[PDB]
Amino acid sequence: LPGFATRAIHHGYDPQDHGGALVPPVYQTATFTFPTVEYGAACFAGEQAGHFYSRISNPTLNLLEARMASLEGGEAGLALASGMGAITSTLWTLLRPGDEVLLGNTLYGHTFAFLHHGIGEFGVKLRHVDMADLQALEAAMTPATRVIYFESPANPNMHMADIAGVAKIARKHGATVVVDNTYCTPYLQRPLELGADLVVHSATKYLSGHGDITAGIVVGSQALVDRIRLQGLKDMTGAVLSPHDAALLMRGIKTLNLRMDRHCANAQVLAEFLARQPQVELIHYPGLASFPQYTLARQQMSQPGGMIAFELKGGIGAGRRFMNALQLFSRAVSLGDAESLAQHPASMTHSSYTPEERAHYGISEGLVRLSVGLEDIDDLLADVQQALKASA
Amino acid sequence: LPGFATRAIHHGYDPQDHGGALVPPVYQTATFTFPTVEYGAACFAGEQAGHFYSRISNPTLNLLEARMASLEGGEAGLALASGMGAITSTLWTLLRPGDEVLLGNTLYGHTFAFLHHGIGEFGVKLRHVDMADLQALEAAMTPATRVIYFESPANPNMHMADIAGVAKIARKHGATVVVDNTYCTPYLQRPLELGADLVVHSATKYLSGHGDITAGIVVGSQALVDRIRLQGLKDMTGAVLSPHDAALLMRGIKTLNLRMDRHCANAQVLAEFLARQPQVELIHYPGLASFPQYTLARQQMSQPGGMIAFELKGGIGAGRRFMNALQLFSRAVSLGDAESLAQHPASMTHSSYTPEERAHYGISEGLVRLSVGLEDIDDLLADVQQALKASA
Amino acid sequence: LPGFATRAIHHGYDPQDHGGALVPPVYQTATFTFPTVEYGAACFAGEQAGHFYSRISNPTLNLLEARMASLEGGEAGLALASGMGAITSTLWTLLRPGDEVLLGNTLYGHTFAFLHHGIGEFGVKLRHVDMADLQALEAAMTPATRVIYFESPANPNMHMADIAGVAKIARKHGATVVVDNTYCTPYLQRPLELGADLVVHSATKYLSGHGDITAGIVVGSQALVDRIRLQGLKDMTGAVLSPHDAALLMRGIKTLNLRMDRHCANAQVLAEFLARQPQVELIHYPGLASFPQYTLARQQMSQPGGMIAFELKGGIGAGRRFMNALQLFSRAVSLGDAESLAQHPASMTHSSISEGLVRLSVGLEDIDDLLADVQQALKASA
Amino acid sequence: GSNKLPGFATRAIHHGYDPQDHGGALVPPVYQTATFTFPTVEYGAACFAGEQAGHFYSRISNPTLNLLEARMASLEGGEAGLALASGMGAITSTLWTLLRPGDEVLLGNTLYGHTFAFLHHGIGEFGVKLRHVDMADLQALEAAMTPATRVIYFESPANPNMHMADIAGVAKIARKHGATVVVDNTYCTPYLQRPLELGADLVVHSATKYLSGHGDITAGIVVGSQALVDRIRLQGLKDMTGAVLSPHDAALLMRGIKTLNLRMDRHCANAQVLAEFLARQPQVELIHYPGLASFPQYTLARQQMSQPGGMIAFELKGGIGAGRRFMNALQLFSRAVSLGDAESLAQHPASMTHSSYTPEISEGLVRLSVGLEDIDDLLADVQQALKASA
């Protein structure tokens, strides 16, 4: 097996099959033709019996898919228009009325909204459990439990699950494990190598790395991915990825290892700095020894990531003032960009709501989330330092 | 006030507001930042109230949406990753278990599959009705009837619905009317002017015109479109359109009137040619006086369209031969491209599941569909001519 | 031979050669690799001996070139980063110190500047001649004359050259005739069929049609185009066209016939209208019966074009007021866009060519809207 | 405090752009427009009258290209930037602007092949006099200076041998005599070497190479004084080459520049490991890598370049049969004549670019552009290919 960086650059492509083109040509074409009629029917007989033919599919998307499957260590990939496209296409395929899905206690907002206000209104039953508590997960299992779905680390506090421990429970009961591996990327964590069946990504974030595309990825077995392609994507969401954007995503993936190394190195320094500041009450970073799941983080993730969450002593007011004071960090809801980003859900995504409603799965008044970018660490430190002064 | 071609080129954009740029810049950015968290908060708060906030949405997408709303004569537009993304985002928003949807008798294949194998398996009730039979439609209405959905013209015979008659019925019973207007485009037919509530498009086809993007559009009232944006798109499909592709779609729309004029002119010559030929049993072209719904077609459509369907004497084998002899027309499933396309579903989309399972009857068997392109009509005539000879 | 519209969509490409892709894939790659060193020796043991293989060249650019060569009825095509790229690559290849280039009396501004302040400052001799006056052109030929270069029609009055007449004169001296065919496009005029050796285009204008790319095209005989590729482009300008923009250009070309028909139809209406307005002193539109070169125009052009120039009676102030009143037409210097454009050089390009000269690039908008805009601007010009 | 220059990586990502001026867009929108319109006729006379007199007021300039230019200027420490369709576009637009018949240009002893061809068979055939001088020999340079010497032009390190020049030393001679110094900084990028900060007047790049980093665009950059860059814009580019860069490609070049520091660090780290490994292999006769003390200009390389680059040249024992066999055995390195890509590339000039000629550049010479792949995979490829050349 070539190394990760080699595979991120080369896997699945030989220039000699495309006239020597070092960079694969971009198939910006909505349709492909047939040499004869019966040739065209072999293709569409193939699908609907369950099988996926790679001509009649887009070679640009097929390469992205193959490369992502390689990096995750999985059999098959699927490229979609957004992370939400990946999540919905997957879950719409795998669940029907009467099935139960077991969920991590805290999810990305639109994932939560899709589950509770979307598929959960179509007869699918939902239950949240703490995926770190393997006792409680085992106790929540029923024979109708079809899917276990979580993020690790999860928003907001970077709470982790023991993926291999969850997978053991799933295997005993007969459930499918879907992990949103957006935060880590395959460079830091490979849930399929720990027993998960499927991984989903918002490739909009670190995989792209540059904030210029929206994309999703699914990786898993050929059997599952084919179903998600043929039903979830083709019939239930139509979340088709542009070949232009797939090509830009592959461009980003060529520097994934280098970018993640810098995101993590910057984040570790910033996290250690924040831990020593008088304005800061609590910090959630996997790379600090104080992190409650430090041991599990070191076992499951090869580096502690680019994401930091922390709480300011002065609560929502201090959070607002801190956020407003940032000059180099931008105020924005995304993550995994070259540019450093910050958000303070209490005064941003959840503002008109009351303090008591920010509670059950839970948003601290003072919780700030940082996506630590690729800028010079001294410039980022200076920005954070002044914004902490301004937070009082 | 301004004419269709003027609006397709200019609507919603003045260069003087973007530093004089004659062509609007392409916003290929996954996210937008906020000057304050309070500003950011106000955006997410009103989104949670059900209000869509233009700007802090993507200006490239917003311009495409405004321009399509203008061309269809609707209040609001929505851009999505594919036609299927348009259709699914709409139907997932409008329907819940217990609701019924009345459908046109024949549907595009993935639409059919979505309804019967997708949303229909989540407790939504389906019934097909002839949307030209207002008495059958009235009789099929129930208190659960929430949506009426069809294409006009519809495959394979270009069967027309009586859109104004359907809408009257829908308004009486409180149902929402959704029309897939892909075939005509707003240049030939505007279902919202006939009482439809929503129109959907595979912008992949004629709106693009050049077969290089995949895209969908919804146009209708602000109230309906806002729900579809905020629930169907954001939560249930994630079918997000690339700004690169949105810009190309706008580029295509600038010649829509010209292209549709030529598609219709060419198709009429080919249909009148086909009418005079001994190998042709039957032709479905709205512009021939013998088309069964010629008068209704003319009330709803300003020109008879770019699509022809015809049946060969000799059935499946004659079709197979016709298709394999074509040298200028390509064998492919799409439509609305500059390139002329043909398909014979009996031996392409539907060969392997063979003549017994084609128990639609009047639909299949010997039927060839032409998407008449923009090439020189004498070249297209010669190609059809020689393929007809080869069909014997 | 397939018809123009068929060739603009199909020429040079079969989907069956590229895995069925209806639209050809975009080769957005700077480099191409070799299967063995033996093979990669062939590709540079060949350009060194003046031979262009289609192997280390880009397939997207090659297809665009092939299609443009087909539309102009020439042997070979070359794609470049701009019309100025086409013009300079061509003239740098064909001229050396002491050579003479005979020029149409009026040229696009940057072409004029290139000639007078660029190549003309490196010892190349320039002379301007009326390319409709065949006796004057003949009397201007010298042994140094190596190239005859002009636009037809030319700014500001749409002055026409007699292309076949020029070619006949050139042939007696072996001189190379280069025609800038930007205004007409191959759909309206094909100078190579009238005896020119090379045509150049700012593909930025009508060929693209949509105002979103900058690009140039050269079409001509194989020997000349090869030298322009291997010397002018490769070594003297580096005016390399992006494969992305080449793909967009090909996209524009698929509707060239339909767009030109509408540009011409709209300009015909606006010219009939303007020609009888009180405020209008003179009008230059090839489709008007009273255009001085009506007959020659109709011999060379299948339609009279999308461009109109006219002169307002009230001079520079009238021109200014007209321009500032326009609400649908945009104030800009380009042409050949879907959007209608207007310029008044006396108050725009030339702060200090008539005082009242206005040029319209008539676009694809509804003619009733363009007429209303021009009408109210005319009233405001009083 | 606030008068501290932000770090190189911060500037490569942010310089020149605030999202709040473009409706919050985190990534700047792409101005894929050939033309810009005017609010009145007068606003437009002021722009066109200004460009004639010598000015680059933005002048209704393309904001995508302007941002790229300002960012490249910041990184090189220059006043102004200009973006063009290729490296040759940058080189030709620059030299066509600065030279006229009777002027002399002094040239480094080796040049990129198309640059050599432009000079000898292009501008040199229009009355511009050429002379080649070793730009590392400051005595020889001083002695070659004449009253007609208008431009001194060279690459450092030079294609293909990596010969270096003392840029500050050259600049000092040019100051005394009056010549304009133009340095092709392609190989190093501003991350490794900033010739303007050493006294050069202009720098040019094939941004096609490292600045892009991903082998998908062709592009050139010039950086220097506002006066010289404006002149080159308004004459060389606008009138003499038309080498216009696509806004689409300019945006991709900015995307590449956001990772320039990280990529250059990995190119150099990999090349150092590969150069140290190659130096110890039986079949390697000589190796030229700036980071090895065997490099003939080791101390000049250390002085001018913050890291020793991504390029290696070495000679195999066993001649052309060796090099030919080494090349054809490569399974991860590609056979290609380019550099600064994510993909590692190799060439053997004897069996490739100079194959048409006879031995009468050594016969076992190989040039490597070391990419971003895992070093263990690159070592294994080179090691198995050395076995096959044996």
From Swiss-Prot, chains A, B:
<dbReference type="GO" id="GO:0018826">
    <property type="term" value="F:methionine gamma-lyase activity"/>
</dbReference>
<dbReference type="GO" id="GO:0047982">
    <property type="term" value="F:homocysteine desulfhydrase activity"/>
</dbReference>
<dbReference type="InterPro" id="IPR054542">
    <property type="entry name" value="Cys_met_metab_PP"/>
</dbReference>
<dbReference type="GO" id="GO:0030170">
    <property type="term" value="F:pyridoxal phosphate binding"/>
</dbReference>
<dbReference type="GO" id="GO:0005737">
    <property type="term" value="C:cytoplasm"/>
</dbReference>
<dbReference type="InterPro" id="IPR015422">
    <property type="entry name" value="PyrdxlP-dep_Trfase_small"/>
</dbReference>
<feature type="binding site">
    <location>
        <begin position="53"/>
        <end position="55"/>
    </location>
    <ligand>
        <name>pyridoxal 5'-phosphate</name>
    </ligand>
</feature>
<dbReference type="InterPro" id="IPR006237">
    <property type="entry name" value="L-Met_gamma_lys"/>
</dbReference>
<feature type="binding site" description="in other chain">
    <location>
        <begin position="202"/>
        <end position="204"/>
    </location>
    <ligand>
        <name>pyridoxal 5'-phosphate</name>
    </ligand>
</feature>
<comment type="similarity">
    <text>Belongs to the trans-sulfuration enzymes family. L-methionine gamma-lyase subfamily.</text>
</comment>
<feature type="binding site" description="in other chain">
    <location>
        <begin position="83"/>
        <end position="84"/>
    </location>
    <ligand>
        <name>pyridoxal 5'-phosphate</name>
    </ligand>
</feature>
<feature type="binding site">
    <location>
        <position position="108"/>
    </location>
    <ligand>
        <name>substrate</name>
    </ligand>
</feature>
<protein>
    <recommendedName>
        <fullName>L-methionine gamma-lyase</fullName>
        <ecNumber>4.4.1.11</ecNumber>
        <ecNumber>4.4.1.2</ecNumber>
    </recommendedName>
</protein>
<dbReference type="InterPro" id="IPR000277">
    <property type="entry name" value="Cys/Met-Metab_PyrdxlP-dep_enz"/>
</dbReference>
<dbReference type="InterPro" id="IPR015421">
    <property type="entry name" value="PyrdxlP-dep_Trfase_major"/>
</dbReference>
<feature type="binding site">
    <location>
        <position position="369"/>
    </location>
    <ligand>
        <name>substrate</name>
    </ligand>
</feature>
<dbReference type="InterPro" id="IPR015424">
    <property type="entry name" value="PyrdxlP-dep_Trfase"/>
</dbReference>
<dbReference type="GO" id="GO:0019346">
    <property type="term" value="P:transsulfuration"/>
</dbReference>
<keyword id="KW-0663">Pyridoxal phosphate</keyword>
<feature type="modified residue" description="N6-(pyridoxal phosphate)lysine">
    <location>
        <position position="205"/>
    </location>
</feature>
<keyword id="KW-0456">Lyase</keyword>
<comment type="subunit">
    <text>Homotetramer; dimer of active dimers.</text>
</comment>
From Swiss-Prot, chain D:
<dbReference type="GO" id="GO:0047982">
    <property type="term" value="F:homocysteine desulfhydrase activity"/>
</dbReference>
<dbReference type="InterPro" id="IPR006237">
    <property type="entry name" value="L-Met_gamma_lys"/>
</dbReference>
<dbReference type="GO" id="GO:0018826">
    <property type="term" value="F:methionine gamma-lyase activity"/>
</dbReference>
<feature type="binding site">
    <location>
        <begin position="57"/>
        <end position="59"/>
    </location>
    <ligand>
        <name>pyridoxal 5'-phosphate</name>
    </ligand>
</feature>
<dbReference type="InterPro" id="IPR000277">
    <property type="entry name" value="Cys/Met-Metab_PyrdxlP-dep_enz"/>
</dbReference>
<comment type="subunit">
    <text>Homotetramer; dimer of active dimers.</text>
</comment>
<feature type="binding site" description="in other chain">
    <location>
        <begin position="87"/>
        <end position="88"/>
    </location>
    <ligand>
        <name>pyridoxal 5'-phosphate</name>
    </ligand>
</feature>
<protein>
    <recommendedName>
        <fullName>L-methionine gamma-lyase</fullName>
        <ecNumber>4.4.1.11</ecNumber>
        <ecNumber>4.4.1.2</ecNumber>
    </recommendedName>
</protein>
<dbReference type="GO" id="GO:0005737">
    <property type="term" value="C:cytoplasm"/>
</dbReference>
<feature type="binding site">
    <location>
        <position position="112"/>
    </location>
    <ligand>
        <name>substrate</name>
    </ligand>
</feature>
<dbReference type="InterPro" id="IPR015422">
    <property type="entry name" value="PyrdxlP-dep_Trfase_small"/>
</dbReference>
<dbReference type="InterPro" id="IPR015424">
    <property type="entry name" value="PyrdxlP-dep_Trfase"/>
</dbReference>
<comment type="function">
    <text>Catalyzes the alpha,gamma-elimination of L-methionine to produce methanethiol, 2-oxobutanoate and ammonia. Is involved in L-methionine catabolism. In fact, shows a multicatalytic function since it also catalyzes gamma-replacement of L-methionine with thiol compounds, alpha,gamma-elimination and gamma-replacement reactions of L-homocysteine and its S-substituted derivatives, O-substituted-L-homoserines and DL-selenomethionine, and, to a lesser extent, alpha,beta-elimination and beta-replacement reactions of L-cysteine, S-methyl-L-cysteine, and O-acetyl-L-serine.</text>
</comment>
<dbReference type="InterPro" id="IPR015421">
    <property type="entry name" value="PyrdxlP-dep_Trfase_major"/>
</dbReference>
<dbReference type="InterPro" id="IPR054542">
    <property type="entry name" value="Cys_met_metab_PP"/>
</dbReference>
<feature type="binding site">
    <location>
        <position position="367"/>
    </location>
    <ligand>
        <name>substrate</name>
    </ligand>
</feature>
<comment type="similarity">
    <text>Belongs to the trans-sulfuration enzymes family. L-methionine gamma-lyase subfamily.</text>
</comment>
<feature type="modified residue" description="N6-(pyridoxal phosphate)lysine">
    <location>
        <position position="209"/>
    </location>
</feature>
<keyword id="KW-0456">Lyase</keyword>
<dbReference type="GO" id="GO:0030170">
    <property type="term" value="F:pyridoxal phosphate binding"/>
</dbReference>
<dbReference type="GO" id="GO:0019346">
    <property type="term" value="P:transsulfuration"/>
</dbReference>
<keyword id="KW-0663">Pyridoxal phosphate</keyword>
